[PDB]
From a paper:
WXG100 proteins are a group of proteins of approximately ∼100 residues in length that contain a conserved “Trp-Xaa-Gly (WXG)” motif. To investigate how specific sequence motifs translate into specific structural features, we determined the atomic structures of two representative complexes, the heterodimeric CFP-10/ESAT-6 complex and the homodimeric sagEsxA assembly. The overall structures of the two protein complexes are similar, with both forming a four-helix bundle, in which each monomer consists of a helix-loop-helix structural motif. However, the novelty of this contribution is that by using the iterative bio-informatics approach, we can show that the WXG100 protein superfamily can be divided into three subfamilies: CFP-10-, ESAT-6- and sagEsxA-like.
The sagEsxA-like proteins form a homodimer and the structure of the sagEsxA shows that the driving force for the interdimer interactions is principally hydrophobic in nature. At the inter-dimeric interface, hydrophobic residues are prevalent in sagEsxA-like proteins although there is a pair of hydrophilic residues Y18 and Q36 within the hydrophobic core of sagEsxA. The side chains of these residues form hydrogen bonds within the hydrophobic core of the four-helix-bundle complex (inset) and the presence of these hydrogen bond pairs between Y18 and Q36 is indicative of the anti-parallel homodimer arrangement found in the sagEsxA subfamily of WXG100 proteins. As a result, this conserved pair of mutations can be seen as a fingerprint of anti-parallel homodimeric WXG100 proteins. Therefore, both the CFP-10 and sagEsxA loops are considerably more flexible, which is reflected by the presence of different conformations in each of the copies of the asymmetric units. The CFP-10 subfamily is structurally more closely related to the sagEsxA than to the ESAT-6 subfamily. This is reflected by a root mean square deviation (r.m.s.d) of 2.07 Å for a superimposition of the core residues of CFP-10 (residues 11–83) and sagEsxA (residues 11–83), compared to an r.m.s.d. of 3.43 Å for the equivalent ESAT-6/sagEsxA superimposition. Secondly, by examining every WXG100 gene in its genetic context we could clearly show that all WXG100 genes from the Actinobacteria phylum are encoded in a bi-cistronic operon containing a CFP-10-like gene followed by an ESAT-6-like gene without exception, whereas, all the sagEsxA-like genes occur as mono-cistronic genes in the bacterial genomes belonging to Firmicutes. Interestingly, the sagEsxA FRET signal could only be detected after extensive heat treatment. This result shows that the homodimer is stable, and a FRET pair homodimer can only be reconstituted after heat dissociation.
Author numbering:
A (entry chain A): 0 to 95
B (entry chain B): 4 to 97
Amino acid sequence: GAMSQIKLTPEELRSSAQKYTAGSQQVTEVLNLLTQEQAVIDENWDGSTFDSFEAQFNELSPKITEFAQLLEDINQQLLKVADIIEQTDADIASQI
Amino acid sequence: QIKLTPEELRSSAQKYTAGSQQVTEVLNLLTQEQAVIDENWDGSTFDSFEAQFNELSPKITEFAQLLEDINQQLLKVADIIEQTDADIASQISG
């Protein structure tokens, strides 16, 4: 099962995990910033010249949030798996 | 009609192109991490996360490109307006 199938150590899992959570935060930050810029552009540019970009942004936006949530979810799972493996190593060590 | 000056337009554009780049950076970086996990975790347990990531990836690419396209248009419009503002100033003064 998992103990056999997983080759990464708890430390290696945590190292990967950190990249996912940093990535998730960066994606969220870009989305929030540019969602604000879209509004600014909408309010200081009367008309409909910008309507097509607005709509593309709006359609993709929820997908970007899903991505960010996925990356954070991967972080959480990796961390929990690392903990479980680490405790396992500890228990097996004691047993002998 | 356009309340934003060319300088304000370029300031906004810079945020779009930096966002584009940053989003793509995260995608590329974690695409390699996905491969690390795939290679070092045998079996199908991580298959769902792999599928979800692979499914969203193309949208992340579309979004990054949308961001850059917006940047490029903002720059073009800023240039147009810059020339316009100069032409009008020169008209009135001259």
